[PDB]
Amino acid sequence: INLAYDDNGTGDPVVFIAGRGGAGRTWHPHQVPAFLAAGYRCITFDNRGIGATENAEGFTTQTMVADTAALIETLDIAPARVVGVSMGAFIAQELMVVAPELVSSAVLMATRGRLDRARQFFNKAEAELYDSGVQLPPTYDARARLLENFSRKTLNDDVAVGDWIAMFSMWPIKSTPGLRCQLDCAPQTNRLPAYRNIAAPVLVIGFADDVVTPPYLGREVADALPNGRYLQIPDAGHLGFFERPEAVNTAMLKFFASVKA
């Protein structure tokens, strides 16, 4: 299948890969304008399992890597810069393994390279939640999103919390066969040994208060990557890029301006 995508600007191409449950649209409130102002061309799209393909099941990481590859080819932008978060970082990482020629450099946020215990606990809890058929009431659900995703600093802030709660109604996350299948697109094995063969410059960004994918797992990906280096953002939850856009964009942009297209 070809997937919905969204092409802006002219210049060195950057492809954004969202996390589980996220659409291309996730990149537009805070990332795309800042990249455009810096002269890049931005591509965002809907991962398989999202939007038009939310009933897609039986797909794997590998299917998702080929989707991304196909997109990079179909637009004739190889090699592109690649920005990915979480599942998206994991898809970026694996694309660079099978198709290094498609990617010039990458930013990977909130990522990991093996099946660590935090990931297992989360895999079990989430899978269980889906198979039970249970519907969390909205306010309890909004509470879990709040604690899962934001820094302590943010939660202490009355105006922000009102926003983030409001903002949840504009970003409904429907439980779908696609969303369940994306649960499986995560490392199953140690991938760090495979990562030691990636040539491309890579920046790994860890968010300090991240509990879904804690920072130290990003240091590990940065260490396995010959040209990798790790950066940490203080006071950012798992949605660090939405919560601290300026600090996050400045870092991706200083990094991307330092490497060749």
Provide the annotated active-site residues.
86, 210, 238
86 labeled part of a ligand binding site: yes
Q: Are 34 and 253 in contact (CB under 8 A)?
A: yes
> What are the E-state strand segments in the chain?
5-8, 13-17, 41-45, 80-85, 103-109, 202-207, 228-233
20 labeled part of a ligand binding site: yes
How far apart are CB 221 and its own copies at their closest, in Å?
Answer: 15
- When the beta carbons of 214 and 228 are compared against Na ion, the nearer one is 228
- When the beta carbons of 56 and 198 are compared against Na ion, the nearer one is 198
Using the 8-state DSSP alphabet, how is residue 130 labeled? H
For its own copies, the binding residues in 141-170 under the rule CB under 8 A are 142-144, 146-148, 152, 155-156, 158, 161-162, 165
First-to-last CA distance in the chain?
A: 28
The first and second tokens of residue 13, run together, are: 């191409």
Question: Which of residues 117, 169, 172, 246 is near its own copies by CB under 8 A?
Answer: 117
Q: Does 5 bind its own copies (CB under 8 A)?
A: no
103-109 and 228-233 beta bridge pairing: unpaired
Question: Which of residues 3, 36, 99, 116 is near its own copies by CB under 8 A?
Answer: 116
119 labeled part of a ligand binding site: yes
Number of helices (H) and strands (E) in the chain: give both, helices first: 12, 7
Distances (CA, A) of 49 to 10, 29, 56, 85, 183: 29, 22, 5, 16, 10
For its own copies, the binding residues in 176-215 under the rule CB under 8 A are 209, 211, 214
The first and second tokens of residue 81, run together, are: 């810069």
- When the beta carbons of 121 and 171 are compared against its own copies, the nearer one is 121
For Na ion, the binding residues in 200-259 under the rule CB under 5 A are 228
Q: Are 9 and 24 in contact (CB under 8 A)?
A: no
Q: Name the residues that contact Na ion, by CB under 5 A.
A: 228
Residues of the shown chain interacting with its own copies in the complex, contacts defined by CB under 8 A: 116-118, 121-122, 124-126, 128-129, 132, 134-140, 142-144, 146-148, 152, 155-156, 158, 161-162, 165, 209, 211, 214, 216
Annotated binding site for substrate: 20, 86-87, 119, 238
